[PDB]
Amino acid sequence: NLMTTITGVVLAGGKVDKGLLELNGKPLWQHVADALMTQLSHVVVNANRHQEIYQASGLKVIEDSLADYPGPLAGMLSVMQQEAGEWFLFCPCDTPYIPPDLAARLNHQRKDAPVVWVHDGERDHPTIALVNRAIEPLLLEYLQAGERRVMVFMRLAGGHAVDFSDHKDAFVNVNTPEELARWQE
Amino acid sequence: NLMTTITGVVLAGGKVDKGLLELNGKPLWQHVADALMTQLSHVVVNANRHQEIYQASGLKVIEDSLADYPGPLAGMLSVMQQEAGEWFLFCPCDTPYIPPDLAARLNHQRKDAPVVWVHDGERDHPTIALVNRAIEPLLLEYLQAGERRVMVFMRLAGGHAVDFSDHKDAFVNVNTPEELARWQE
Amino acid sequence: NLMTTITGVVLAGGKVDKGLLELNGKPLWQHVADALMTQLSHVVVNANRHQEIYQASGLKVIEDSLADYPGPLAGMLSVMQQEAGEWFLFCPCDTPYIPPDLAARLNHQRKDAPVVWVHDGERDHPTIALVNRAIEPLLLEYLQAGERRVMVFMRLAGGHAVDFSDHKDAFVNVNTPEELARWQE
């Protein structure tokens, strides 16, 4: 089952974390982790600050790097370098309503591509992505070349966006404390 | 083939059985069991009463529990706890006309989800479901929390309904002796 | 797991059954069925008499034939013609102490052969056999030719015996009521 083949990954922030703010009593990042854990057996967090907090919830923490690369791609590569699965489902810390069929729908719609990411009907969410580790070398080469754009990389790897326009407000992102108040229950 | 990979399960009733009433000379529950047995090699019955009757037809009977949980979910979990397959096709005792392509269509339309159930064009039949045992832990947690709603659970697991609107009257349910008379041949 | 890939088969007798006699309160044939059911999910009985008794224990009964062939091979072929698995573990009704690792050891020692049977250190037990359905055509041809010898057939199919000389008295066969008394507890 996908549950035992894809490693879930909370992208908590590369070199505070707004993901620590509570939504309905639970920190934003833990909404994401809990949603991934309902669908996937093995779930880790990519974090470079507050490691003890993430770890304290029973999750393994993967710290970045080797080289101090910038942005989300750097965390993705760090996780592939430090974890053995074939497949990873990444999600940032601030999208607490991700749907219960995230992994299944992304996988079903992959069309044999090594990477896919969510399009919510309005925009792309390239860091909510199902990634095969076969693109580890390409990612390393991309970052070594000084490149940083997420979607450009994912397209260059042969990926595409998957339509989640029917999953209402599942991909809302909590940008600030103020937005968080529009969502408190 | 699906025939040898999915265990069929007649949900005969958790803690008489109207499924014992005869439709065209054959008990309602045996219509269901026979339909499952045409499509699947290994088929069992979840029953907590009249166990000897079900067993007498050559079917293994799984009794509920561990804990006295309520409703169909309790029987589903009981069956996963007591049977070793990866996949189960559950069906209640009172839907005698289930189609010969039930398992194939549910599986084909799963879209990589760990659970799917029938929608007949008019309504959901959440207890006519193809279930991967990976959701055993989630089900246990759900029931331990005091929750009982079937479709809510199946959605939370990442499942969805599968359209059988073209399978005419295949999902009629015999609620009472009176309805049973509308169907006698 | 082997549990969900091999169909167990009690060879109860082709055209009373001494296998109906009780050993320590349980009929000989049910000792065998219970031993197979501990190791295998799906288990059936090949019987041509007392079908209701076997069936009443929750086991599907396969009756012989098509053609009225003689002996155990006839039952084996009948079962392959009427059951869909790839693999079958046959055992006669009168060997109640068959070991809990029967299927695993036979499979482990197959050496890529399509059939293997037990040798107990003293003699062959060719009807205690793990059989791939690929030899269905060969068996049919053998029986159509008027041949009946079990071990000859199994050798001709490319099979061999597997040493169970360390499984003490596991393959005792209860030939008569008198032998049964040497074993009563």
Added chain:
Amino acid sequence: NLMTTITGVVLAGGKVDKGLLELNGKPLWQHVADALMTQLSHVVVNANRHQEIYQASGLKVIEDSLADYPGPLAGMLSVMQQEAGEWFLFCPCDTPYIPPDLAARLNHQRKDAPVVWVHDGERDHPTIALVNRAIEPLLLEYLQAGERRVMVFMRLAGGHAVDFSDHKDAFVNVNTPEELARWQE
């Protein structure tokens, strides 16, 4: 590849063969055999007359039976009883223009069903069918019960028709010498 997993079967006639008549210098049945052999490695002929002729082309001949059942289903069952593959692609002797993508399209459109057959846009061709051997037991039971209708059986097994309406005149059947003249090149 499908080429090495599906056994092709020319249904040449159960208990002359009009399939022996030549179309553009090649016997109708050999048009079918050649089309199957382009797509599939292992191809056999079900024949009960002129066995030497079919065999002489390098094809193994499977004769019917065990029991003298009627019609095409009888040949299908005979072939499953005498051949070891999981999958069979049957075709009658008189449809010489069957397409080069017959096996691929039938398989692609199976929708997890154990049997599928061709619909040419105007009618069903239930004997041009892709069949999983899991339905061997059901077929045996059907024929033993005295039933003979092909499509009824295939529906009861959970099968469906596959649209080949775009494959122009690929499913023309040569009923008589006269029709054969409408096709001579």
Added chain:
Amino acid sequence: NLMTTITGVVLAGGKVDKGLLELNGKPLWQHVADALMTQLSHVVVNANRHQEIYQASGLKVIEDSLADYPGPLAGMLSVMQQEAGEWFLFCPCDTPYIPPDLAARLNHQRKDAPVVWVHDGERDHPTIALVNRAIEPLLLEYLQAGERRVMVFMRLAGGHAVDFSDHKDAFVNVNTPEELARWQE
């Protein structure tokens, strides 16, 4: 690879933990967890006390039960009921020197059995075991019957011991604070 197919499990104690005592600066239970984590991606702890301590190391904690069963078997069953893998490698908290090839050797020596445990040359260690979840139903039945003996259960499931007599002092168990002093570096 085995790394991504077998779930590691530290058996930390069912209803203080001596496994909390430090050996060379690291708690005994964490020696075990670290050894399992070198070989396996996903590793959990079965604990019913000090849950926060185990969880704080980044490990998911599985608490016992459903029913208050006794002993290690109860923890094994609890873990299978609450975790989705096919395979589990259990180890108690007080065997800190378990070898780096534990999972590979147990798996290699399984001989198609659904469970295997370590024999160190002097004695059995039945709670250092590689277990297929197919024996979940058997375990449940065993415990419901009031049975508790570990090795008896594992033999009844078809398992056997695997020789680790060449892995010197790898299976030393720290019974008390005094034994722990014989090992301090």
Added chain:
Amino acid sequence: NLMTTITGVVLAGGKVDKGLLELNGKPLWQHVADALMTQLSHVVVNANRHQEIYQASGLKVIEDSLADYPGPLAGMLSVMQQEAGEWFLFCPCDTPYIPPDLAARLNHQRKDAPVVWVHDGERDHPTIALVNRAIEPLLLEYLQAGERRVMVFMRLAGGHAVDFSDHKDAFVNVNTPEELARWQE
């Protein structure tokens, strides 16, 4: 992943190479090789001239033949005869803009066929093809018969075209130095 299962093949020319001309500083053939290498681990070049140039880029060169057959099919067959994979993705040297999802889309759209090629919305590109080695024998027979037409062969093998009409100008072919100037950046 497809990356490690399909061998990429640059069809550089059977018995100068215009593919040696530079587009934006990189030879046309190396545009193709680089595009294939982003998607596939193992990539080779079919060349019969300038072998040292192709080889110098780190690519293995496969020279034609056995028999001096004509055209692209000859190179395809040469490559299947000299390389061990199951699957090959061929592309000529003069289509430098082939898309990053070439292999994934061709594979996803194969519909169980052993060969597929690109249609760009305006025309077929039968030498941009995903080919299963099962058609090696058919290809050999075709060429031995004196036949040379690419698309005819691919249709006869059971293949079809795959729509890439949405991949803008990805299949432009540089026919001459003059066309190459319309594309210089």
Added chain:
Amino acid sequence: NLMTTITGVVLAGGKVDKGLLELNGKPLWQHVADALMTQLSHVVVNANRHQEIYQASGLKVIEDSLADYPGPLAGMLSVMQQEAGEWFLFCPCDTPYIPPDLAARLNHQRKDAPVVWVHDGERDHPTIALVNRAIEPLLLEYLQAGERRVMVFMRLAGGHAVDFSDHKDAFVNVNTPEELARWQE
């Protein structure tokens, strides 16, 4: 099963056949073909003379070549070039007593090698070999280089001999009419 994965091949002679002489009423080559057909579904003959005779038994005939190479290796390569399986079991026409477990024992003893051949206790029989088609390219290169020695090639490919010293007189070869008389029954 091996029956449906390995193609049997009678090596009948490259550019009369003593294999046509009758042993106990059946031609030597047909003893071999029949032995292969008991173990394997799909069996072909490599022949360059008397093609009609071999074909007349229902076997497909593969004629040599492309290039007029010498010896048994030439026939092996011809067969791999013209047949789609992954695995081939070759045997010459004059070893009529080959054992019923030939394919299983060769496969079991392969030790992950791409080719294995029989050693009968006294000598090697390098043309009684189980061959993976991955060595097709190596074979082509070997023959193109002007090399002909069978065992040298098989060793260079990474193969080894498999001990059949316990299969008494199974590998007797009938060199002449005179030897054939020592064997007539």
Added chain:
Amino acid sequence: NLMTTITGVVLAGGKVDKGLLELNGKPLWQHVADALMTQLSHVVVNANRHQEIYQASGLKVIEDSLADYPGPLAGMLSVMQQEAGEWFLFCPCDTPYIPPDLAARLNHQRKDAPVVWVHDGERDHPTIALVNRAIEPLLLEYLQAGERRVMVFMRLAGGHAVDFSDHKDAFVNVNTPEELARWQE
């Protein structure tokens, strides 16, 4: 086949190459590359000097790093970070007589371990190793910790040595020009 699943790797030297010296007219490193290429489809070279020379033979060159780690382990990790296979067979540049069954024997003797290396009867050759990429994270952690010992790492990963004591002088290493003269033909 192993040929298409394991990537061969010549370890040519991390930050002249004595591997450039000719043995019987062929550079030592090319003896190794050629031996790997006979057994494996895809073979690369890890080199940090003379990259153009290695590349010129048709081999892809992987340069070290990310971080400037020391020794052979650094090259192994570099290759896993930059190549997508599951399995790698590493060999240094100066062991020109490596046997034709290197990959098969190492794989056959792995005993489910993620890494194995050659023991020649006299000593270990830990850089002649079959490595699963699952140990990429462990290797990274090991090197980041400042550790460099090869065999220690391979043991810590759960590996073991494989006996090649019967492969005479296959593992001779050419240390110097003088040793090279003891071997010139």
